[PDB]
């Protein structure tokens, strides 16, 4: 009938329908029922038709006042399409729609209760990567906003036989560069190394800074990809300051106001979407957690260390804790010095609370990732800790990709 | 052939064999996989002697030399045992090695490294609930050994039939008692409050006090439970002190030092073992994070935060992240004060990582429940967080249980 969900934190119980209608391994990272692989072939009409039906099913029974005429209408008008053509196109309203239910059934996302407010470009009509460049430029300064930041979605044109995909290659719109220095040492993101390499092999100018904004990896059309600079006036950044330690800037740290994911693809109704950009605002832990207390990032946890005075020799001491928070403390205080848009952890899972229990009610389920939902550092402390949660597939879904450069046939 | 593992913090890559010899709900607390109910007739000999047969080979194959002759003559000894019983019995020796091997096999436990240092209190000859009494004082007083810490384990008589189960009521040994009081609050720990009330039903004295150490409900070979007081003097307990706030100890807490759980059952080589009681030594964070922080337990949270001067009123100012990390020091700070065992939840992650990677070339495997093995507190701050790991239940194998007042039939 249904599976039954607990709070452990407020006892309450919650019945989960949702995922009858889904398509140990837990702690993996990107598995395979999370991926959307390539294909050399269309495909099949016998596939294609059910889910688009289902789609079509699913759109126009979200109206609030259901409009039957264009329903059997829009059906027959899609059947007649994918007929004739092999395939179909979604109206504006869909695809809009589709990238809301995406979002929706997102279940690593923790900022899904701002679901409905997504603004979404529509660039199926691109066909080079000096547009696709223009597109994303567009979407950068959109969605930054002065520091006002706007969640924001552009939709490149749907896979047609596999052959002429759309692909950003890049992880993230904005991200800085890794670089092996002649020293031995590392310089900036340790993490986007071979990437920063595979740049400088396709031409661009390594700058062998602490914080280079990388370029955009373009390929469209099946095309090989293309190198394009982000515009520096474009790139909205923070300066990283504390609001007690003035030591904290002489750390020399910042890092961007915009998070935006590049590399997954839109599935719905049978269609799919191997480029699609989008991006919300920032939870203050990614940076200040993740971004610079990863051993594999920028490392600063020991420097603040000392800094501040702990001892840093003894664990128990509890200095990485100390540190830590010291540290997303400074991150939380500079955005919200410079005006720019972000939110804190604690905040965050309260409000992905609320939208769990928004979404039970509205229709007996949401999907749900605990692994990725309870944030990086103080989890039992937050309410996401203590809910019990199911992790299924839906439809539409934002999947991810096997890396582009594993699979492209080079040209020249 | 195996499953792929990786490290995303040093990339390093494992192969897991050992889930071959295993028997999206992920963030259920205690699934049915996990648990292991009751029965009312013996275990059928068709599933017995294959698993007695796998068992006595696993047992005989760890050996550095092998032992051939006792390793044939035993599996024939068994045989026979089971056909003339329908049942049979494990070699001290044997048991001991089926402990240490379950608690190897705990994919929730993160002390693992010290499976193979454990104390077993051979209690299979019990016959009555004061004798179970007995026993549970040896273990409780072995086991705390004035504050230097030892891991211990007491097995009681196997299940035969499942009508002559041998039940500890508790979920652990030591256990705070909740009260509501006549004024609507609560008094101690809030998550007892039925178990107290039952505890009252059965003829326990309520001293409603904050910290009052709850009876042992015993439960002897199907007979109806009998309540048993712990020796105060058994019950070792540390003051709670802060190492720079006076104020600290003004909050008038403690907690015991002995962490053991109570209700679980041990399965091995068929056999079953409803009553095992075990412990080893505290996490900080458990106590410091769970047992004080959770607003459903001691809920010591948003006091602590005025004490220090904090701004409890915006959540983004971190204060909750501030308080919780001075209250685990004050946890650490008082255990190493009163010379009572104890890890801090860094040092505890560093241990199991090197566990997992010792067990990884012994046997190549071990089961891990990410989800549990995780810290409250200060996740990615560990190296556990960023390790990929399988989750199966092998054998020997810990499992839950089915509370024992929702399956008991009351006799007077
Ligand atoms: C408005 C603010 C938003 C916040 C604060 C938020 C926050 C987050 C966070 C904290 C993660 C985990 C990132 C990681 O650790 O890798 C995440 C993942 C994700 N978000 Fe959101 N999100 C927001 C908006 C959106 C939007 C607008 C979409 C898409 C239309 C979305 C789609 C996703 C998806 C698909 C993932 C999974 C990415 C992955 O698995 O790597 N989110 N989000
Ligand atoms: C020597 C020190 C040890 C440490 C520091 C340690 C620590 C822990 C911790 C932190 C948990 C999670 C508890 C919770 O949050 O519910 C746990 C669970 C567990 N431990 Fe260990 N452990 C130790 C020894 C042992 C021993 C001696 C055994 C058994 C022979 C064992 C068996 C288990 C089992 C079965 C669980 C799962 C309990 C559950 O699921 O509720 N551990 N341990
Ligand atoms: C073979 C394909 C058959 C498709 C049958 C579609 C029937 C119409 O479907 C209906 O649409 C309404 C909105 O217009 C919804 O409110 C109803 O819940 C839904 O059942
Ligand atoms: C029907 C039951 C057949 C049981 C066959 C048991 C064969 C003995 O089993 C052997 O025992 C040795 C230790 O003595 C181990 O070292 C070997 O790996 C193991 O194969
Ligand atoms: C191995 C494990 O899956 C990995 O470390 C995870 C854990 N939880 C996460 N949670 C979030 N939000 N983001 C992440 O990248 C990860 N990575
Ligand atoms: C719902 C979820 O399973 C529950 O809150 C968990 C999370 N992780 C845990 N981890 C440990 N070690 N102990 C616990 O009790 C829990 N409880």
Not at 171 to 196: H, K, N, V
Not at 374 to 391: A, C, D, K, R, Y
């Amino acid at each position: 009938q249904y599976v039954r969900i607990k709070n452990w934190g407020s006892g309450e119980i919650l019945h989960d329908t949702l995922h009858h209608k889904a398509t140990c391994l837990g702690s993996i990272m990107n598995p395979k029922s999370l991926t959307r692989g390539p294909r050399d072939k269309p495909t099949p009409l016998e596939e294609l038709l059910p889910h688009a039906i289902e789609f079509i099913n699913q759109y126009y029974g979200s109206f609030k006042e259901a409009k039957i005429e264009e329903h059997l209408a829009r059906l027959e008008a899609v059947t007649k399409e994918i007929e004739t053509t092999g395939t179909y196109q979604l109206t504006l309203d869909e695809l809009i729609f589709a990238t809301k239910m995406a979002w929706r059934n997102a279940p690593r996302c923790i900022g899904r209760i701002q679901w409905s407010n997504l603004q979404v470009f529509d660039a199926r009509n691109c066909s080079t990567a000096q547009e696709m460049f223009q597109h994303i430029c567009r979407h950068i300064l959109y969605a930054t906003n002065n520091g006002n930041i706007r969640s924001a979605i552009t939709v490149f044109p749907q896979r047609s036989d596999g052959k002429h995909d759309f692909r950003l290659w890049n992880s993230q719109l904005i991200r800085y560069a890794g670089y092996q220095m002649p020293d031995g040492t590392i310089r900036g993101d340790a993490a986007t190394l071979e990437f920063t390499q595979l740049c400088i092999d396709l031409g661009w100018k390594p700058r062998y800074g602490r914080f280079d904004v990388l370029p955009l990896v373009l390929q469209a059309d099946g095309q090989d990809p293309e190198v394009f600079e982000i515009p520096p006036d474009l790139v909205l950044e923070v300066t990283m300051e504390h609001p007690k330690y003035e030591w904290f800037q002489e750390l020399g740290l910042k890092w961007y106001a915009l998070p935006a994911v590049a590399n997954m693809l839109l599935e719905v109704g049978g269609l799919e979407f191997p480029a699609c950009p989008f991006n919300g605002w920032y939870m203050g832990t990614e940076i200040g957690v993740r971004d610079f207390c990863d051993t594999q990032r920028y490392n600063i946890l020991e420097e603040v260390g000392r800094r501040m005075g702990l001892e840093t020799h003894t664990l128990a001491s509890l200095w990485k804790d100390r540190a830590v928070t010291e540290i997303n403390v400074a991150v939380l205080h500079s955005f919200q010095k410079q005006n720019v848009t972000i939110m804190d952890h604690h905040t965050a899972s309260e409000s992905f609370m609320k939208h769990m229990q928004n979404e039970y009610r509205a229709r007996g389920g949401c999907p749900a990732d605990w692994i990725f939902l309870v944030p990086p550092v103080s989890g039992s402390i937050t309410p996401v800790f203590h809910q019990e949660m199911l992790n299924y597939v839906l439809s539409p879904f934002y999947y991810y990709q096997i890396e582009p450069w594993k699979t492209h046939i080079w040209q020249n």
